[PDB]
RNA sequence: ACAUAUUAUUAUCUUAUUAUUUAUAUAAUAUUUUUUAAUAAAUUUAUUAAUUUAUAUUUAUUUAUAUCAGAAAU
RNA sequence: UGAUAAGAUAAUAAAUAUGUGGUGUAAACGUGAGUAAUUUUAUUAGGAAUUAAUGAACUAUAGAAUAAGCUAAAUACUUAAUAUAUAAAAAGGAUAUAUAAUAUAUUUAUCUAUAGUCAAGCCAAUAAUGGUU
RNA sequence: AUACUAAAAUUAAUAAUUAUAGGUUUUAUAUAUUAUUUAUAA
RNA sequence: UAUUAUCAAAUUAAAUCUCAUUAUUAGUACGCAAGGACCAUAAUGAAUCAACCCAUGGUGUAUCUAUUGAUAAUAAUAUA
């Protein structure tokens, strides 16, 4: 996971990516979640780094922050690479605009 | 592990690649399309997880099948299972049916007769599975030099091994073997003398309609020593050496033919360092007879 | 919106026609 | 979190659409907030008009603008409510499901699927009926 | 004085779907072509994966128009 | 046949419509919500834009049915062969004779062309409840 | 630590051990372009 | 109960002292039935207080990026 967000790695998670956090079935009874990366929070300690994910399920918008180093996630895989038009490091401004995330799950199908 | 095990692994990979749907190969065996495969998540049989990317497959060498033949499965029917799985492929798949060569089937017959011992089942499978090969526009698999000659040698050693004086059935075996051939590469001429040896051993008049009456023409094997080329040199005519030795052992009159003896000694020189395949085959047959 | 532009274009045309009728009268 | 005179959405099929909180039940200071999963007293400020095509209309809705009802807050816009796993979930608009004063089971029979996302903490508080009815529990 | 509802239109907002529109992609498929490797064959060819030339169909994003339905107003 | 019995070939007698194909549900049945009519109904010795390289599906006639690819194989699908200023097509199955898969004869199927039958698209004239509060 | 005080840390430069603040170096955070690109040669 | 550095008991001044819901006992005791225990235990909370910034939100005249209008300056180039 360090190499998944390592600053020296080109193929790292950036604002605009869409990811599918996978939850360990054995350790927890959670369900897989799909979201759009708004911010990648990096702190002085490596362990306390989290991703903020947005998804407009039906007509409700859901923001979720997930500790990237929690032992309840087995892998975060990337579905859609980010576009090269959005101009920022954290895409907090997409909420409410026509640039918003929309329904990710339906678009995949 | 052994040469046969790696050969089985490579052959299985070759078969699975050439058994997938044409429109699915670009999404599986092409590394660049790995992301596409993950995204599409095709539903595989037995309702399992979608397929993972796989390495590409390159054309397979005959030495892999040769190694797999040389691997030891004395009482294991793995050879029969592999032959069934290979012969069950679609006729349209050219690669699967073009990998089979006269040397391959000859080696199958030899290994089946000596090491596996259950020559009856393999010969029944090979002889039975001929129409599909013909539909695969691959009739050269059966030829006098490799397929028919090996069958005659196996028949000779089988008669030697087990006493069978019923001449009619032996004639029927000879006739079915004669008709099973398609390409008819009768060049060395050993087949005619082999059938004569069978007739003397049993006591029936030789009869091979359409047989070309060519004499013994065995090219002189050089006695020089080389690297991988030498390995091939002996193996190239190894079967021929097996045929000559079987003729010499079964037929006492075979000592008259000096060309067979000249071929034998040449091969022997060229093979003095390593063990004699004929003696090794007899020793394996005796050890595995029980 | 294109709806507004089309409506304005139609209204301008019809007002022009009405003015033409008044001038003719 | 919501307080007195906080208008919050209703995501039940019990007719009510918008409700305004009046009180929080299991709290001592009336100025305390209402978190996700605690009973609140609501007065409906918007309702779907009732028809009379079917004789003996089912008592599922029985909602008119002004009636007093109890509800469970099912989702919130707050972004710092931490769970044990360390994650935090913030929704777009707060919502509630009306529940009976005495029995406790919801007034409605099925939540609508188009706005039926509920916080997962509600399950741990013991509201299995709401979570089972909800389309997705995040 | 004032209350509700039902229906219809929109120089309004949101929008499912669909249709069409200006382009993009070191995008996919198959042909052809300039090349790079591995493997296989008999002892020069073919297969595979890449690399430029275009070709026909799709895929994803984007510009624009219309659209179920909902909201707002009359 | 298969050197000892697992497989394979031909014939005969059965099963399989949870695999792949074909065909039918644009009809019939029911109802009267909408529809006062630029679109619906009824009538006309009505009409032209001069209404289809249309046959959906039978009849008469004539001709044709070729090669690859994919599917496990196919009368499934894709690409090519020739054809009424050109273009546009298909499919074999079953039954008996003879050669060493092919040619025959029967039966049922596929496709094209002309004609007929059935059947269709568009327009015109006249009429179609009440309220001008 | 703190209103001024008070408390606490350092005042090493020697035979050996001690970093208080500023500056410097390293790592990291933030900001936002970058594989169509950064340093080197052959 | 006569120094300094440090550790410091008794003591004095003051703070705190809780309450509810559910569950078990138990639908037991009581009661025709309806209804429904005491004693005690645990789990959840409410109210009040103290401390902390690993994480979350706020701030962040540290800093970076984007941008409208106006003015000034450094370097390179051309000229004298
Ligand atoms: Mg617009
Ligand atoms: Mg308006
Ligand atoms: Mg839209
Ligand atoms: Mg609209
Ligand atoms: Mg079926
Ligand atoms: Mg009908
Ligand atoms: Mg009606
Ligand atoms: Mg044909
Ligand atoms: Mg067809
Ligand atoms: Mg000093
Ligand atoms: Mg310091
Ligand atoms: Mg030091
Ligand atoms: Mg310092
Ligand atoms: Mg003390
Ligand atoms: Mg006490
Ligand atoms: Mg107090
Ligand atoms: Mg903090
Ligand atoms: Mg911090
Ligand atoms: Mg923060
Ligand atoms: Mg902060």
């Amino acid at each position: 996971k360090r190499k998944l967000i390592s600053k020296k790695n080109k193929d790292r998670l950036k604002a605009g990516d869409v990811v599918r956090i996978v939850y360990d079935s054995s350790k927890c009874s959670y369900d897989t979640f799909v979201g759009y990366i708004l911010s990648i929070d990096r702190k002085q300690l490596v362990q306390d780094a989290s991703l903020l994910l947005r998804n407009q399920i039906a007509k409700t918008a859901v923001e979720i922050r997930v500790p990237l180093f929690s032992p309840l996630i087995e892998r975060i895989d990337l579905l859609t690479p980010h576009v090269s038009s959005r101009q920022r490091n954290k895409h907090y401004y997409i909420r409410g605009t026509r640039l918003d995330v929309g329904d990710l799950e339906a678009g995949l199908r | 592990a052994s040469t046969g095990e790696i050969a089985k692994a490579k052959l299985d990979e070759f078969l699975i690649y050439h058994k997938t749907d044409a429109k699915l190969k670009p999404f599986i065996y092409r590394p660049k399309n790995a992301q596409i495969l993950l995204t599409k998540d095709i539903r595989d049989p037995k309702t399992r997880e979608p397929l993972q990317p796989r390495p590409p497959v390159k054309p397979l060498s005959k030495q892999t099948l040769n190694d797999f033949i040389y691997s030891v499965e004395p009482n294991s029917t793995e050879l029969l299972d592999w032959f069934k799985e290979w012969t069950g492929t679609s006729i349209r798949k050219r690669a699967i049916w073009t990998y089979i060569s006269p040397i391959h089937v000859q080696k199958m017959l030899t290994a089946s007769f000596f090491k596996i011992g259950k020559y009856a089942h393999m010969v029944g499978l090979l002889y039975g599975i001929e129409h599909k090969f013909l539909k695969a526009q691959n009739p050269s698999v059966f030829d006098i030099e490799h397929f028919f000659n090996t069958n005659i040698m196996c028949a000779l050693h089988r008669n030697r091994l087990k006493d069978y004086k019923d001449a009619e059935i032996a004639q029927r075996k000879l006739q079915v073997a004669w008709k099973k051939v398609l390409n008819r590469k009768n060049n060395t001429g050993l087949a005619n003398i082999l059938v004569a040896t069978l007739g003397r051993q049993i006591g029936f008049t030789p009869e091979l309609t359409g047989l070309q009456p060519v004499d013994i023409s065995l090219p002189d094997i050089p006695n020089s020593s080389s690297g991988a080329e030498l390995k091939d040199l002996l193996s190239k005519y190894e079967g021929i050496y097996l045929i000559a030795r079987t003729l010499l052992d079964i037929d006492q009159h075979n000592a008259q033919y000096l060309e067979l003896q000249e071929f034998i000694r040449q091969y022997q020189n060229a093979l003095s360092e390593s063990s004699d395949p004929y003696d090794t085959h007899l020793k394996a047959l005796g050890l595995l007879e029980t | 919106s294109a709806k507004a532009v089309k409506f304005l274009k139609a209204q301008r045309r019809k007002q022009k026609n009405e003015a033409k009728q008044a001038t003719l009268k | 979190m919501i307080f007195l005179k906080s208008v919050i959405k209703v995501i039940d099929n019990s007719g009510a659409q918008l409700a305004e909180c009046i009180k929080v039940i299991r709290k001592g200071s009336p100025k305390s907030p209402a978190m996700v999963g605690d009973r609140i007293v609501c007065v409906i400020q918007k309702a779907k008009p009732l028809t009379q095509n079917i004789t003996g209309t089912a008592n599922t809705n029985r909602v008119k603008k002004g009636d007093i009802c109890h509800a469970i807050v099912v989702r919130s816009k707050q972004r710092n409510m931490c769970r044990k796993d360390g994650s935090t979930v913030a929704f777009g608009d707060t919502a509630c499901v009306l529940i009976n004063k005495n029995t406790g089971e919801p007034l409605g029979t099925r939540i609508m699927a188009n706005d039926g996302c509920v916080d997962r903490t509600l399950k741990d508080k013991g509201y299995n009926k709401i979570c089972s009815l909800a389309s997705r529990v995040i």
Side-chain angles (χ1 to χ4, degrees), chain D residues 23-134:
Chain D
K23 203 139 290 288
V24 192
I25 290 295
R26 214 64 72 179
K27 293 268 192 312
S29 160
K31 306 169 148 149
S32 64
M35 292 322 314
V36 171
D38 46 315
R39 311 186 72 259
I40 80 164
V41 202
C42 295
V43 48
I44 283 81
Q45 286 330 286
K46 214 210 179 193
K48 172 171 310 207
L50 200 70
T51 171
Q52 282 300 329
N53 164 56
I54 302 306
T55 55
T57 57
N59 79 308
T60 84
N61 318 300
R62 304 219 51 84
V63 284
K64 312 90 187 181
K65 178 185 175 65
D67 58 343
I68 306 299
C69 303
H70 285 69
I72 307 297
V73 181
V74 290
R75 84 163 82 111
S76 184
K77 290 190 61 183
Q78 257 287 8
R79 325 193 270 279
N80 72 14
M81 305 152 311
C82 290
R83 342 194 173 192
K84 303 314 173 180
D85 83 298
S87 78
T88 61
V89 164
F91 299 92
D93 288 344
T94 174
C96 84
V97 167
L98 292 213
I99 75 145
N100 198 356
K101 282 207 24 174
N102 307 115
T103 69
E105 37 85 29
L107 276 300
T109 320
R110 294 183 181 277
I111 182 150
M112 62 303 295
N114 63 34
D115 209 26
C117 306
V118 183
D119 202 57
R120 193 182 42 203
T121 313
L122 190 97
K123 186 169 301 187
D124 317 83
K125 307 291 185 55
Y127 303 72
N128 321 335
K129 313 306 172 181
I130 309 178
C131 293
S132 59
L133 229 43

Side-chain angles (χ1 to χ4, degrees), chain B residues 104-119:
Chain B
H104 276 148
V105 278
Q106 153 156 32
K107 291 155 196 167
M108 297 301 179
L109 296 174
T110 58
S112 303
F113 194 84
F114 324 123
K115 293 179 179 179
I116 280 184
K118 286 165 78 70
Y119 184 67

Side-chain angles (χ1 to χ4, degrees), chain D residues 7-24:
Chain D
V7 155
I8 84 173
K9 214 155 50 175
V10 198
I11 58 183
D12 213 7
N13 78 339
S14 69
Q17 313 189 72
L18 272 195
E20 149 185 303
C21 170
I22 293 317
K23 203 139 290 288
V24 192

Side-chain angles (χ1 to χ4, degrees), chain B residues 70-84:
Chain B
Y70 290 128
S71 68
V72 315
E73 38 272 50
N75 313 326
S76 158
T77 57
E78 160 206 42
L79 220 48
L80 298 70
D81 296 359
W82 181 93
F83 193 47
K84 283 166 186 169

Side-chain angles (χ1 to χ4, degrees), chain B residues 17 26-27 29-33 36 56-62:
Chain B
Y17 173 81
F27 304 113
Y29 292 89
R30 274 178 181 164
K32 179 62 173 171
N33 304 7
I36 313 170
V57 178
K58 281 167 192 307
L60 183 54
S61 200
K62 313 194 180 171

Side-chain angles (χ1 to χ4, degrees), chain C residues 3-23:
Chain C
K3 285 174 181 176
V5 188
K6 172 56 186 58
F7 185 31
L8 278 152
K9 187 203 141 284
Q11 221 171 287
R12 294 183 181 277
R13 190 175 158 209
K14 307 329 166 280
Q15 294 300 320
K16 169 221 149 203
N17 171 41
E18 283 185 13
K20 161 74 70 168
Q21 280 289 45
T23 51

